[PDB]
Each structure stands twice: as C-alpha cells, then as structure tokens.
Amino acid sequence: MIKKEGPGWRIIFDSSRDNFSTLIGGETWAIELDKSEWKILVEVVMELCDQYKLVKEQLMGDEDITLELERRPWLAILNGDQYGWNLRLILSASGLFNRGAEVYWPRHVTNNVVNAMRSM
C-alpha cells in the first residue's frame, strides 16, 4: 500500500478503504483514521512541532515546556525540553463509527513521526 515506519511508529495509507484509509501506530497501539481526521492531524502536529522548534531555542538547561493545540476533533499536547518532546493526542468521538481514542508517542520517536507526516 503506502507505508512509512520505524522503531516505535508507523503510518500506513490503504487506498482500497473507502473510509478508514489511514493507520497511525505507536509501540503498543494503532488506530485507523478517516481522510478528514488525517488531514487535520497532520496540520495540528506540524504547527505544534514548528511552534516547539522555534521556542526551544530560548530554553535554558532542562527547563521544560508544555504546549497544546486544539483543532476539532483533535487535542494535541506536547511536553518537552530543549532536547526532545513527547506528544499525546486526544481524538474526540464523532458519529456512529468514529470512536474516540487517545494515543501517544514518546521523546525522539516524535521527530521521526513528524518527518514521515511532512513527506506525506
């Protein structure tokens, strides 16, 4: 199909699926997403990561930062320091099939995930 992956993460797109055509995964979880959800997720994550990369330049030592960005149906929560960041994602439920979910990628793995998203 169309697959990008590495230690602790994966992104898979399957065009034969008329609805849940994208899969995102971490080390112990994976969830399917519809085209709308996927589009908004990439937008949110790219913005939050861009915000983090710019602001991390003023962090002294092991000073931490927490950033959140919400764009329905997603709430993205970033926690990091000048050396890395983790990301918790809360997907609010919608309609009959779009169950809610909460997922998380740890420090360092996040950079690999956003690079994959960015290329897609």
Q: Which residues bind a copy of itself (CB under 8 A)?
A: 19-20, 23, 25-34, 93, 96-104, 106
Q: Binding partner of residue 83 among a copy of itself, Cl ion, none, CB under 5 to 8 Å per kind?
A: none
Q: Which is nearer to a copy of itself, 38 or 52 (CB)?
A: 38
Unique residue bearing structure tokens 């329905």: 72
Among a copy of itself, Cl ion, none, partner that 25 touches (CB below 5 to 8 angstroms by kind): a copy of itself
Q: Hey, what amino acid is at 105?
A: W
CA distances 98 to 30, 59, 86, 116, Å, are 14, 38, 25, 24
Q: What minimum distance in Å lies between the beta carbon of 87 and Cl ion? A: 25
In the bound state with a copy of itself, the residue whose beta carbon lies nearer, of 25 and 48, is 25
**CA 88/CA 103 separation, integer angstroms:** 6
Q: What stretch of H or E contains 88?
A: strand 84-91
Q: Which residue is nearest to Cl ion (CB)?
A: 19
Kindly tell me which of 6 and 100 has the beta carbon lying closer to a copy of itself.
Answer: 100
Q: Kindly tell me the burial class for residue 8, based on how many C-beta atoms sit within 10 Å of its own C-beta (0-12, 13-18, 19 or more).
A: middle
- Considering the complex, what minimum distance in angstroms separates the CB of residue 91 from a copy of itself? 9
Which of a copy of itself, Cl ion, none is residue 100 near (CB under 5 to 8 Å by kind)? Answer: a copy of itself
8 Å CB contact between 82 and 56: yes
